[PDB]
């Protein structure tokens, strides 16, 4: 069961794996396994991205040959950073630095700018073959009346699936917000003679506000890797955190997906938790108060962010890019 | 009025020009004018294509810097020749030979395979910018419930418009079946900072059968540039040709758009016509009988086809390509 350790390492903290038997079959073959994560460099990295960065670390240590696709063209399609390609590229350079400073073994990761794929006719050749095997309906349920959905929105998924096939991947890692694109890839792979990828989805940390994903939309609802210790204390203190409630609680998600992601992590509270489940029980049994959890999470998050913030702000050029980005 | 001769030369025999004032403004500027025609090399050329080939000849003699886009990727999208790219390319080599043998000054025409555009990231960059400026509805009315229309059908028009912008064209020549794509290009050009092209549409000769465009679908309803003199006599003899009727009459369309396209052409009948309008009047006034028109048109068509057929069949390689094509 060498497959068992690799599997648990890859599966740890994921929301789903489509499908586990398929992954186990891949692990059992002994053959080289290729995987990637594609993300839109849409702004300054916030802590939510750390969840998939840690997963990249897990896949790499599990023997998967990994690539990170800086999906710049996709970000452009979604008008991120006003479609300013320079700012999008800048956001990607920051992500690389954040990943390294976060402990990901970037030396073993191949970073690819979507531009390299865009320059190959064979890539567009695949975008077309993929489009020929999926109805406008099939593609539409992977995304609203026609008059409001601009055509570039239908190309997005087509490109997403083509990125996976073009890179000859056995595995597609991504947040749960990528599941629809991944299902389309799986539904189309055999028709095109391409590998049906195993889809591995990571959790998406909720907005600190309340009743919504964490993103650069409302600064106060997201903790950026460059926020000050005081900004982190404020944002966490004001965070939605229902007593005894676990579902929808971002404070608990941060504890579970980011703080306890670190093997050997401990959360000291005014009790000392050696596991997340322990904390959750005590939290459910009203034994742990929202305000006490907040402070403890805030202070631990500060330790996680401190070194990442340093690697970014302590690099003049990067600090410059960070400011250009925060400009738009 | 130097603009007047160039204009009448370009306008001669077209169904429409969107718009004439725009073309006259272009002609009047004295600036270099660029234009093209894009067509799917979807099989053996039939006489219907001669109409746009003669128009290419007119544009070139009118001073337009012209290109012919062998829209191979578009043909693939429509599964022409079973998507066999080699056969599609072969159909394009035959078209070049046919154009030359038909009298088009091919030395002054730049032939471009869609593959050259497909290899440039900037081209796909335009396909995306175009898709961002046109709703799925706008694009859909340029083409049926979602579940039957495969996604590649929405990309087709996007690529068609991008071909025009990428080649920096002032004019887009094409059959009336290209009008919808051309209107989308015109509706989008200013939004993207691209030249709004003048659209010039040529007539599409009807099927010889009756109540449908002429195409390789039903061999007997189309005259190919390589049909024998006997095949031409049979197909024309059996052709739909309502007495005194002009609308929908393919026999008359052939006379008007192909035979009289040639300056100084005469149609000798068992009367001698020096103009098409003359023939049509006499035909309307029952003065010309269907069977008499048929024979005369058949015999003249044979003279037009004879040399084209020779240039194609008299070239061994080409004859080989012709046979591979007729294989699928």
Overview of the molecule:
By secondary structure, the first copy, chain A, is α/β, with parallel strands linked by helices. Chain A folds into two domains: 1-205, HUPs (Rossmann fold, 3-Layer(aba) Sandwich); 206-328, Tyrosyl-Transfer RNA Synthetase, CATH 1.10.240. Chain A is built from 15 helices and eight strands. The first copy, chain A, has helices at 2-11, 20-29, 48-61, 72-77, 85-101, 114-118, 121-132, 136-140, 152-166, 179-189, 229-237, 250-259, 276-284, 290-313, 316-327; strands spanning 16-18, 34-39, 65-70, 110-113, 171-175, 198-202, 267-268, 272-273. Chain A is globular. At the A-B interface, helix 4, helix 7, helix 8 and helix 9 of A face helix 4, helix 7, helix 8 and helix 9 of B. Chains A, B: It holds the Pfam family tRNA-synt_1b.
**Under CATH, the topology of the largest domain in chain A is which?**
Rossmann fold
Most strands sheet of chain A: 6 strands, mixed
Oligomer status: homodimer
* Strand order of the biggest β-sheet of chain A: 1-6-5-2-3-4
As for the number of domains of chain A, it is 2
Largest interface: A-B, 34 and 34 residues
How far apart the termini of chain A lie comes to: 51 Å
Name the CATH superfamily classification of the largest domain in chain A: HUPs
Order of helices and strands of chain A: HEHEHEHHEHHHHEHEHHEEHHH
Total helical elements of chain A: 15
Helix content of chain A: 40-55%
Beta percentage of chain A is: 5-15%
Rg of chain A, nearest Å? 20 Å
Task: Sum this structure up briefly.
2 copies of one chain form a homodimer. Chain A has helices at residues 2-11, 20-29, 48-61, 72-77, 85-101, 114-118, 121-132, 136-140, 152-166, 179-189, 229-237, 250-259, 276-284, 290-313, 316-327, and strands spanning 16-18, 34-39, 65-70, 110-113, 171-175, 198-202, 267-268, 272-273.
